[PDB]
Swiss-Prot record:
Keyword Lipid biosynthesis: no
The EC number(s) this enzyme carries: 2.7.11.1
GO cellular component assignments: cell surface; cytoplasm; cytosol; endosome membrane; extracellular space; extrinsic component of plasma membrane; nucleus; plasma membrane
Source domain of life: Eukaryota
Keywords of the record: Acetylation, ATP-binding, Cytoplasm, Disease variant, Immunity, Innate immunity, Kinase, Magnesium, Nucleotide-binding, Phosphoprotein, Serine/threonine-protein kinase, Transferase
MF terms in GO: ATP binding; interleukin-1 receptor binding; kinase activity; magnesium ion binding; protein kinase binding; protein serine kinase activity; protein serine/threonine kinase activity
Protein name: Interleukin-1 receptor-associated kinase 4
Species name: Homo sapiens (Human)
Length: 286
């Protein structure tokens, strides 16, 4: 299904895993908790090489998990796996490179990219939803839905990535994983449910409206989730939080997206809409 690489081929393609940023002529594109992503070229093909970095048996399990899911799931709103490398202690995953990186980076204008327009942010949300929907229809729960995991191609097509924590099929776990700033309350407890993915997507929709990261240690309030409490308790409005880095954001569509986000952000798992409803609401928005 996927091409098996030898770890040395990948050392060659990535200029021996150069840690300098791609903007400066290096190879580093970014990093998560489970690894660092590098740029490369395999047979004229631009690739993204995720070098897994830490426990070892859990990492191998997350590596095998990404491969199993990717083998089954192929969609226009999902990232594409070309191959991998499991030669010794180093575990690598090779993907089709995303010319526009992550939604997180584009929302912050990392490396001087222009701010995304409202129209583009809407199309991106619509893409992301179709991706979550395909995974859900295929009985998969992502477990790590966040803007760092919503990637963008040359046309700004949303592509869901990082399936190392993905699960099949409400169950429980002894190892709590994900990014706390996006995690549904039950997920923080240890519950595994597709409804948690809906909550995480609502945090993403708030990032899309505001241009603010879900968590910022140097910000009051540190958590973007707290901003919804301020709006709900009539102390502020969504208008006070609309990203100032855009000019084409009209209040009707902005409030319409906030409505979807607040429905997604229901405290109670069963009160949240399902993905097909989220898609319907987002399509209605435009
Ligand atoms: C690590 C992250 C944040 N950035 C990327 C990630 C990726 N890809 N592409 C596929 C892919 C899959 C995973 C996973 N799981 C992780 N990363 C992946 N491709 C590309 C970029 C990437 O930065 N392109 C560069 C782009 F942003 C530019 C030119 C404006 O500077």
């Amino acid at each position: 299904r996927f091409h098996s690489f030898s770890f040395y081929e990948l050392k060659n393609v990535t200029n021996n895993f150069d840690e300098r940023p791609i903007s400066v002529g290096g190879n580093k594109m970014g990093e998560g908790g489970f690894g660092v992503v590098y740029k490369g070229y395999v047979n004229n093909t631009t690739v993204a090489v995720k070098k897994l970095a830490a426990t070892t048996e859990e990492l191998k399990q997350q590596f095998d998990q990404e491969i199993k899911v990717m083998a089954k799931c192929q969609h226009e709103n999902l990232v594409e796996l070309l191959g991998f490398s499991s030669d010794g202690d180093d575990l690598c995953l090779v993907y089709v490179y995303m010319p526009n990186g992550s939604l997180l980076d584009r929302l912050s204008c990392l490396d001087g990219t222009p701010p995304l327009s409202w129209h583009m942010r809407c199309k991106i949300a619509q893409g992301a939803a179709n991706g979550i929907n395909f995974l859900h229809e295929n009985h998969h729960i992502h477990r790590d839905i966040k803007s760092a995991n919503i990637l963008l191609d040359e046309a700004f097509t949303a592509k869901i990535s990082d399936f190392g924590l993905a699960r099949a099929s409400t169950v429980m776990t002894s190892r709590i994983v994900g990014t706390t700033a996006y995690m549904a309350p039950e997920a923080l407890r240890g519950e595994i449910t597709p409804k948690s993915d809906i909550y995480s997507f609502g945090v993403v929709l708030l990032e899309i409206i505001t241009g603010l990261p879900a968590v910022d240690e140097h910000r009051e309030p540190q958590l973007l989730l707290d901003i919804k409490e301020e709006i709900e308790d009539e102390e502020k409005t969504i208008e006070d939080y609309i990203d100032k880095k855009m000019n084409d954001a009209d209040s009707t569509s902005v409030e319409a997206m906030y409505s979807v986000a607040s429905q997604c952000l229901h405290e109670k798992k069963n009160k949240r809409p399902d993905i097909k409803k989220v898609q319907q609401l987002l399509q209605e928005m435009t």
